[PDB]
Amino acid sequence: MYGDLGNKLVLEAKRTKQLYARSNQDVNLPMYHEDIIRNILKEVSNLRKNTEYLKEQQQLGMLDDKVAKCQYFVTLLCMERNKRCLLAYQRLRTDILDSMAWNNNGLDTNNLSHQEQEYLKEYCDLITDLKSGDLVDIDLSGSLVPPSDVFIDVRVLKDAGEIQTEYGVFNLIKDSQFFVRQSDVERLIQQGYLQKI
Amino acid sequence: SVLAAANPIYGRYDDLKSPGDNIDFQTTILSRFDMIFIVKDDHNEERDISIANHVINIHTGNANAMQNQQEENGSEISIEKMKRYITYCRLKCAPRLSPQAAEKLSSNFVTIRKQLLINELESTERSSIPITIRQLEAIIRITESLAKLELSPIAQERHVDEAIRLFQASTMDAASQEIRRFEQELKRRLPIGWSTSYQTLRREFVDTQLALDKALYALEKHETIQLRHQGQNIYRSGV
Amino acid sequence: MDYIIDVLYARKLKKENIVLWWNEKAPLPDHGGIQNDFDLNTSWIMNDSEFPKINNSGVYDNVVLDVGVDNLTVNTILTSAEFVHDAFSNDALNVLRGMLKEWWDEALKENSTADLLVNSLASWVQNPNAKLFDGLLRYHVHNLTKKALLQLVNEFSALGSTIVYADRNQILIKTNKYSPENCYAYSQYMMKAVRTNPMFSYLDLNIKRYWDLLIWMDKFNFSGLACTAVSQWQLKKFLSPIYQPEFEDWMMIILDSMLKTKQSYLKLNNSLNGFSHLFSKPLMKRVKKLFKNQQEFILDPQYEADYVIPVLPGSHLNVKNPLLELVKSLCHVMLLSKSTILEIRTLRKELLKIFELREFAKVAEFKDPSLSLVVPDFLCEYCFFISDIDFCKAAPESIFSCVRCHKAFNQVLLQEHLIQKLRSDIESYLIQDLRCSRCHKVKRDYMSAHCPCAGAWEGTLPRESIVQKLNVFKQVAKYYGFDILLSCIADLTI
Amino acid sequence: KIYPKLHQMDMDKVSRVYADLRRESISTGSFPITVRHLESILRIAESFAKMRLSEFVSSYDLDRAIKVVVDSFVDAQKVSVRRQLRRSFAIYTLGH
Amino acid sequence: VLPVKIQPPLLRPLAYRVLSRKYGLSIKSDGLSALAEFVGTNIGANWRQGPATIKFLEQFAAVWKQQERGLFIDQSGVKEVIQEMKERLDWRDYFKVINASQQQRFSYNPHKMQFIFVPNKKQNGLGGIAGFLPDIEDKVQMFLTRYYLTNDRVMRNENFQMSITPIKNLLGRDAQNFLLLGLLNKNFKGNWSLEDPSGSVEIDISQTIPTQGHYYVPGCMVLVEGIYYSVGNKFHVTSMTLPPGERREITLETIGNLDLLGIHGISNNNFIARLDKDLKIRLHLLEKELTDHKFVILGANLFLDDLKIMTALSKILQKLNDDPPTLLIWQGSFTSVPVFASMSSRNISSSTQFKNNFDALATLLSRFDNLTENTTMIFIPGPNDLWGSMVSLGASGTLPQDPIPSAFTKKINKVCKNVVWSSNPTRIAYLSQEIVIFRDDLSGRFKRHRLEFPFPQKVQETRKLVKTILDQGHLSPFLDSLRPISWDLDHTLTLCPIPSTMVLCDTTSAQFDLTYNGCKVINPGSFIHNRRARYMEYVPSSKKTIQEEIYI
Ligand SMILES: [Zn+2]
Ligand SMILES: [Zn+2]
């Protein structure tokens, strides 16, 4: 029956929601269900053909004030349901992509639809437009854990050689350790090169 | 689950003897096994050399370090973690078959049933190793278990391919196991180093009629014939 | 002369009412349009040539007859004698038989032209430029030649002898006799008894050498006394230069000891029993001294050039200890003696002890240092001699000139045959059948992913073997400086 | 008290011994060589090292073990083949 | 620009405050020195002198986002920013030739219903010798890819979305109507048969009615309707047809508009290149703008070792030197005999003779200045060319045939300004037109092997040819046991997004310039025929095809 593929798709939605919600990291979101979506869209096209057939046959006039009213209303509701299921799935994966944008890309691509890939590009362009405009003195893409300590120990987890910072350098020797201003290394903690606190 | 280990009658499998003479078990109890493996000493010298090097590496104590390296490399997991993982898979997941998996399994069932039928005709007796609708459920359970490893809530085409492959590798391989005039006719009429295209041999033998493929299987096991070119050319390769 | 044979065959064919497969425009026979299409049988027919040449390595204290053979192909065509789809047309074959008999009778009546013609037939049955060339005819003649050589070996062995080696030009035969002077009569009896069988009526059976004592592992690696001693070893060529004279010295010492033992045993009356005892202790003392010297000098720039291992055609493998390579070579040559395996084996153990290598250690095992690259059925037109030539195991003089006569082979002709062999093997790789990897059934269908017995499909020519073939081709091309072949090899990758 | 270790093992020799024993054991009625016999060579070599109270198995122990197992195999064969088989196996055992 | 007034320790805070603080890009020291001298060699004055400093650093950072060269700066990366600044349309940037061996390989995934990129492992470096050789796995996947592409193309056609049942579904479904899609086998037992990835079935054609616009050779993918009968395990065929071809636009838009050529960009395993719509339109407008460009195609079987050929050709090239082509396709068997290993040393050897012919040809090209410096030569081998001839002896052989070897090109390569010795299924990627070229004499093979069913001519037997080729979607419909394919390179013979034009050259059929599904297929069948030299002028900016002849 016409609601079923929508239910399969939103059960998929719920499972990917749980997959994302169980962990602190961004779990790489699962494959876009192109096949179920195409089955739904074909089902919607069939329901559209049924409305077309019926609105043709209202010229022929069979009991239309009730019977055609009922057939039309039911198939219309089937289409509303299928729209709701499709938009619920797409809105969840949109929400997760927005989260990933702010977490990393605004500072696994095969699993997205091409609309979702170019959407993620445009949304990263938007985040960068915000932190590049007014309010620029705040790195709007930065962390939301409050700054507890200004100086921190950090252990170098992967090697990256000599890099400059605002008034000096760090030579990121493997398994060396710094005592350093947190604001001068936060980018490297996010990028996974530095370990502690 | 029942995991059982047994030797054939006569202890060693005795390959030239009929399987119905080698196998003690009745077809009733045999049918209750999803997979029946018939295990044989291949006696291949390269294999035996390999096994010898391996077993020496066991007894020397090299293998104690090798297993630890394999576990830390992530190519192997330990008893403890695997025990917990089997428990977790048995409690989280219990997958269904997709419709596509179901059709492939159904057609595979009729295929293996046809193979057993023609083998029972060729050997003019009911087979000791059976294929029954219970054994379709064996392939179903194996499909589901293969999906149950990765906690996939449904089994898919790939899992069915592996389940079919395992059943073919085990129970079918257990089941799988006047011509004297026709073989010497072929030896007379196809001399060394030349090719008879198969269909012409079929027409000639029919024109004299299933003895053909027995003759080809025998002569192909021997060095005398080689089925070249997609099986189209019967090539008198050997003596 | 192939063209004269073409027209003269065309006459007798049309006179026997055969439709004529003369082709003017292309080498392939004009069968109508079908000749233009690839076919697995046709491609097998064109690609295939190798004789199943027999090589029973060993030591032979019996006298060995080095029987040359010639006119083998002519003999098969004369003495020879739808369901079969790569047999040449039996009508055309009967015409070629009767016509060859006619030419041969006129050669026996000393027609220089008919004699020259029958000599040149071996070219025409192979030459693609022959107007009546047919790959089926070439193959029919070739596999009949193969069967005839096997029957000739059957005939000699049926007369109580035993074959050391056999190919399309040569047979070496163990006699079950011990003295050459005793056997100059029996050998001629034996050869006459073969030729008087009708199957071999036309053969040029010729006793080219008498070997009193023979050490043999292949025709490029043998030594013996002839009735006087000769030694030739492709083995030797891979030892570093300090050790090549050392190898020849100990080979002469081995021959001397074997001969002393043979003549001793015969004065006292498989005769080789105990031959190791005449030189084993000197050899061990020598090897110990050489091992000390190698430790002194292998690293030394004064001497290292004599320890550097030679790069060569078909140079199979890397080696770490060149003295060990000499010892492996000597021990392998001596281990050819089936009668005396134990005494050699114990000596080999006592030698490898110098290196502290264990008796069966994988390093101490002898693998042949040379990889064969045989171009089958090369033609010396100057004397119509058909020979397989091995660009690695043969010496350079035997590559750039004929062995029987000594006219030089043309360089570009030679390189063209190597490129033809190379492309034949690449095609044979791409046109191969696949075989099931655990039950050896052939893949008959076109779109299965695996065999019904659950076995994965694998090649009948595994890719590794063809990688190895291209490697020896690049080695041969670099060594002899074959610019055309080397640029062909370059154009494969690039 | 004594638990001899294998060391410096002539892996290629035991491998060739087992491979040849397996090949010649294809004779349908012969003593059925199996992987537990390969492990038996090692048990016997260890027992010989035990007799010496030696915590390492020497080459002499292993060679005596090979001699026992090969002779036990050869001795079980019918006279029609026993000379040929003993001659063939002699390279592994009469070197000791 | 003024002399440099910068040092990296002084410029360091500003470089950080832009690249790191805004965008997270890390200031590795060597890249900082290169960045500092780049800034100094453009600004000159010291970093403190106005917003141009931060504007320049911002421009660097934006170009860094364009080149995506990682989380740390480096001197090579600064050089990339410089080159992208030098880039801050010319048709030569887009016209290129793709040999069979240089084409981006794509495998077709059936489950994902889309293409995926595969690296050409000649790139891997370990393929320095025997990199070119396929793997056995390629052989088992060869026909599967053809089927999956055909099946996917079928499902997109409106007539089917009755529907295909895979052949394995038939077994036991006795006495019932089905539609199949399958590879037309002849079983080893001799019977005609169809095969599918799921299995195969023997067929009876004795009551069938094929559709008439097609050839039906073995190995052709055929849609088949019939009744399955389990009693003989037969499938009795009602009717048979080739699966409908798909127009180029429909294929491209429904596969996701990939660049399968590198006409816009090269692909990686992490990055499938996209055929950008705006650039496609810009190129299309330029393509319509270039009224004057003309591709000249010579006929096949241009034997350089016949004086009559060379005389005719001298006359033709003398015409072309008056007004040079944009491009000039030579093709097909440049020697009368196939050139194979000689049997004798008396005559000048076969290989040497072939070399002499390209010397003679280079002598001709020397006389024609405008041609030699304004055209692009393309050479396309045929059955008589050099390394294929070695093993085939002039028959058909391993089909994605290699270009004629570089040991024999040398004098030609010296005299000509531009040449491409290309594979037999070569491709030209013109501005928007993918143009396949193929030299095969197909029509003889089709008529020689077509299935003979129980139960004007020159136009009909070429409509049949192109409809067969394009509905089959693949230049070699025949089984590999009748035309072997290099297993790795079978993707080059596939036409799945149907080309914009095809020079389907064939010496055993009439000349033509048909159109089918928007694909313009032309055939300048033979160079010397009926005492005329024959050549053909395809005009890309209008798709006209003016045939031309010289009497001789
Ligand atoms: Zn000669
Ligand atoms: Zn198999």
Coordinates of C-alpha atoms in Angstrom, one line a residue, chain E residues 22-270:
Chain E
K22 CA 40.7 33.3 9.7
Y23 CA 41.0 30.0 7.8
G24 CA 43.0 27.5 10.0
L25 CA 45.8 27.2 7.3
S26 CA 49.2 26.5 9.0
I27 CA 52.3 28.5 8.4
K28 CA 55.1 26.0 7.7
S29 CA 58.4 27.7 7.5
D30 CA 59.6 27.0 3.9
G31 CA 56.2 28.1 2.6
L32 CA 56.5 31.2 4.7
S33 CA 59.8 32.2 3.1
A34 CA 58.3 31.6 -0.4
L35 CA 55.2 33.5 0.6
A36 CA 57.2 36.4 2.0
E37 CA 59.3 36.9 -1.2
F38 CA 56.1 36.5 -3.3
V39 CA 54.5 39.3 -1.2
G40 CA 57.7 41.4 -1.5
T41 CA 58.1 40.8 -5.2
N42 CA 54.5 42.0 -5.9
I43 CA 54.1 44.7 -3.2
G44 CA 57.7 45.8 -2.9
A45 CA 57.1 48.1 0.1
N46 CA 57.0 46.9 3.7
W47 CA 54.0 44.9 5.0
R48 CA 52.8 47.9 7.1
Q49 CA 51.9 50.0 4.0
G50 CA 48.2 49.8 3.8
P51 CA 45.4 47.2 3.2
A52 CA 47.2 45.8 0.1
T53 CA 49.1 43.5 2.4
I54 CA 46.0 41.9 3.9
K55 CA 44.3 41.9 0.5
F56 CA 47.3 40.0 -1.0
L57 CA 47.3 37.5 1.9
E58 CA 43.5 37.0 1.4
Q59 CA 44.0 36.4 -2.3
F60 CA 46.6 33.8 -1.4
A61 CA 44.2 32.1 1.0
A62 CA 41.3 32.1 -1.5
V63 CA 43.6 30.6 -4.1
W64 CA 44.7 28.0 -1.5
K65 CA 41.1 27.0 -1.1
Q66 CA 40.9 26.7 -4.9
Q67 CA 44.0 24.4 -5.2
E68 CA 43.2 22.5 -1.9
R69 CA 46.9 21.7 -1.2
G70 CA 46.4 20.7 2.4
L71 CA 46.5 22.0 6.0
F72 CA 50.1 23.4 5.8
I73 CA 51.7 25.9 3.4
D74 CA 54.8 24.9 1.4
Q75 CA 57.0 26.4 -1.4
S76 CA 55.4 24.1 -4.0
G77 CA 52.0 25.4 -2.8
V78 CA 53.1 29.0 -3.2
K79 CA 54.3 28.2 -6.7
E80 CA 50.8 26.8 -7.3
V81 CA 49.2 30.1 -6.1
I82 CA 51.6 31.9 -8.5
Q83 CA 50.5 29.7 -11.5
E84 CA 46.8 30.2 -10.6
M85 CA 47.6 33.9 -10.7
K86 CA 49.0 33.5 -14.2
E87 CA 45.7 31.9 -15.1
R88 CA 43.9 35.0 -13.7
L89 CA 38.7 30.3 -24.7
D90 CA 41.4 28.7 -26.9
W91 CA 40.1 25.6 -28.7
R92 CA 43.5 23.8 -28.5
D93 CA 43.0 23.7 -24.7
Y94 CA 40.0 21.4 -25.3
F95 CA 40.6 19.5 -28.6
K96 CA 42.6 16.4 -27.7
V97 CA 42.9 12.7 -28.7
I98 CA 42.4 9.8 -26.3
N99 CA 44.0 6.5 -27.2
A100 CA 42.5 3.3 -25.9
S101 CA 45.4 3.0 -23.4
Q102 CA 45.1 6.6 -22.2
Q103 CA 41.4 6.6 -21.4
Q104 CA 40.0 7.0 -17.9
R105 CA 38.7 3.5 -17.0
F106 CA 35.3 3.4 -15.3
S107 CA 33.7 0.3 -14.0
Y108 CA 29.9 0.1 -13.8
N109 CA 28.5 -0.8 -10.4
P110 CA 25.0 -2.4 -10.9
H111 CA 23.9 -2.1 -7.3
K112 CA 24.7 1.7 -7.2
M113 CA 23.6 2.0 -10.9
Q114 CA 26.5 4.3 -11.6
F115 CA 30.1 4.4 -12.8
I116 CA 33.1 4.4 -10.6
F117 CA 36.7 5.3 -11.5
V118 CA 39.6 2.8 -11.6
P119 CA 43.3 4.0 -11.8
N120 CA 45.2 2.9 -14.8
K121 CA 48.0 0.9 -13.1
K122 CA 50.6 2.0 -15.7
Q123 CA 50.5 5.1 -13.5
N124 CA 51.5 2.9 -10.5
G125 CA 55.2 2.7 -11.5
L126 CA 55.4 -1.0 -10.7
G127 CA 53.9 -1.5 -14.2
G128 CA 57.2 -0.4 -15.8
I129 CA 57.0 -3.8 -17.6
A130 CA 53.9 -6.0 -17.6
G131 CA 51.9 -3.1 -16.2
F132 CA 49.8 -3.3 -19.4
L133 CA 48.8 -6.9 -18.9
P134 CA 45.2 -7.5 -17.6
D135 CA 44.3 -9.7 -14.7
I136 CA 42.1 -12.8 -14.9
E137 CA 39.6 -10.9 -12.8
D138 CA 39.1 -8.5 -15.7
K139 CA 38.2 -11.4 -18.0
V140 CA 35.5 -12.7 -15.7
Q141 CA 34.1 -9.1 -15.4
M142 CA 34.3 -8.3 -19.1
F143 CA 30.9 -9.6 -20.3
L144 CA 29.3 -8.7 -17.0
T145 CA 30.0 -5.0 -17.5
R146 CA 28.5 -5.2 -21.1
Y147 CA 25.4 -6.8 -19.8
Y148 CA 24.9 -4.4 -16.8
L149 CA 25.3 -1.4 -19.1
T150 CA 22.8 -2.9 -21.6
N151 CA 20.3 -3.9 -18.9
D152 CA 20.5 -0.4 -17.2
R153 CA 20.0 1.2 -20.6
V154 CA 17.0 -1.1 -21.3
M155 CA 15.3 -0.2 -18.0
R156 CA 15.4 3.5 -18.8
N157 CA 13.4 3.0 -22.1
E158 CA 9.7 3.9 -21.8
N159 CA 8.5 0.6 -23.3
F160 CA 9.8 -1.3 -20.2
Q161 CA 9.3 1.4 -17.6
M162 CA 6.4 -5.7 -19.4
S163 CA 9.8 -6.2 -17.6
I164 CA 12.8 -8.4 -17.9
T165 CA 13.1 -11.5 -15.8
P166 CA 16.8 -12.7 -15.4
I167 CA 17.3 -16.1 -17.0
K168 CA 17.8 -17.9 -13.7
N169 CA 14.2 -16.9 -12.7
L170 CA 12.8 -19.2 -15.4
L171 CA 13.9 -22.5 -13.9
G172 CA 10.9 -24.5 -12.9
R173 CA 8.4 -21.8 -14.0
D174 CA 7.0 -24.1 -16.6
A175 CA 4.9 -23.1 -19.7
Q176 CA 4.7 -19.4 -19.1
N177 CA 5.5 -16.2 -21.1
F178 CA 8.7 -14.2 -20.2
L179 CA 10.9 -11.4 -21.5
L180 CA 14.6 -12.1 -21.4
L181 CA 17.7 -10.0 -22.0
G182 CA 20.7 -12.0 -22.9
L183 CA 24.0 -12.6 -24.6
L184 CA 23.4 -14.7 -27.7
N185 CA 25.5 -17.8 -27.2
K186 CA 26.0 -21.0 -29.1
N187 CA 26.4 -23.6 -26.4
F188 CA 29.2 -26.1 -26.5
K189 CA 26.6 -28.7 -27.3
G190 CA 25.9 -26.8 -30.5
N191 CA 22.5 -25.3 -29.6
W192 CA 21.6 -21.6 -29.7
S193 CA 21.4 -20.1 -26.3
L194 CA 21.0 -16.9 -24.2
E195 CA 23.2 -16.0 -21.2
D196 CA 22.6 -13.7 -18.3
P197 CA 24.7 -12.9 -15.2
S198 CA 22.3 -15.3 -13.3
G199 CA 22.5 -18.1 -15.8
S200 CA 21.8 -19.3 -19.4
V201 CA 19.1 -21.2 -21.3
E202 CA 18.9 -22.9 -24.7
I203 CA 16.5 -21.4 -27.2
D204 CA 14.3 -22.5 -30.1
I205 CA 14.1 -19.9 -32.9
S206 CA 12.2 -22.1 -35.4
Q207 CA 8.9 -20.1 -34.9
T208 CA 10.4 -16.7 -34.2
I209 CA 9.9 -13.3 -35.9
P210 CA 12.9 -11.0 -35.5
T211 CA 12.5 -7.2 -36.0
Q212 CA 14.0 -6.5 -39.4
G213 CA 16.2 -3.4 -38.8
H214 CA 19.0 -5.4 -37.1
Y215 CA 21.8 -8.0 -37.4
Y216 CA 21.7 -10.9 -34.9
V217 CA 25.3 -12.1 -34.6
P218 CA 26.5 -14.3 -31.7
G219 CA 27.4 -12.4 -28.6
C220 CA 24.9 -9.7 -29.4
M221 CA 22.7 -8.5 -26.5
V222 CA 19.1 -9.3 -27.5
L223 CA 15.8 -8.7 -25.9
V224 CA 13.8 -11.9 -26.3
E225 CA 10.1 -12.8 -25.7
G226 CA 9.1 -16.5 -25.5
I227 CA 7.6 -19.4 -23.5
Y228 CA 9.7 -21.4 -21.2
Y229 CA 9.2 -25.2 -21.4
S230 CA 10.8 -27.3 -18.6
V231 CA 10.3 -30.6 -20.4
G232 CA 13.3 -30.0 -22.7
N233 CA 14.6 -27.0 -20.7
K234 CA 14.0 -24.9 -23.8
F235 CA 12.8 -21.3 -24.3
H236 CA 10.6 -21.1 -27.4
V237 CA 11.2 -17.6 -28.9
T238 CA 8.2 -15.6 -30.0
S239 CA 10.2 -12.6 -31.2
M240 CA 13.7 -11.0 -30.9
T241 CA 15.1 -7.5 -31.0
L242 CA 18.1 -5.5 -30.1
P243 CA 17.8 -3.4 -26.9
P244 CA 16.9 0.2 -27.8
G245 CA 19.7 2.7 -28.1
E246 CA 19.7 5.7 -25.9
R247 CA 20.3 9.3 -27.1
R248 CA 23.5 10.9 -25.8
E249 CA 21.8 13.6 -23.7
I250 CA 19.5 11.1 -22.0
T251 CA 22.4 8.8 -21.2
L252 CA 24.6 11.6 -19.9
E253 CA 22.0 13.2 -17.7
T254 CA 20.8 9.9 -16.2
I255 CA 24.4 8.7 -15.4
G256 CA 25.0 12.0 -13.6
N257 CA 26.7 14.0 -16.3
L258 CA 30.2 12.7 -15.8
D259 CA 33.3 13.7 -17.8
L260 CA 34.4 10.3 -19.0
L261 CA 37.2 11.8 -21.2
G262 CA 39.0 14.6 -19.3
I263 CA 37.5 17.2 -21.7
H264 CA 36.8 19.3 -18.6
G265 CA 38.9 17.5 -15.9
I266 CA 40.8 14.4 -14.8
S267 CA 39.1 12.1 -12.2
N268 CA 40.5 10.4 -9.1
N269 CA 39.2 7.5 -7.0
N270 CA 38.0 10.1 -4.5

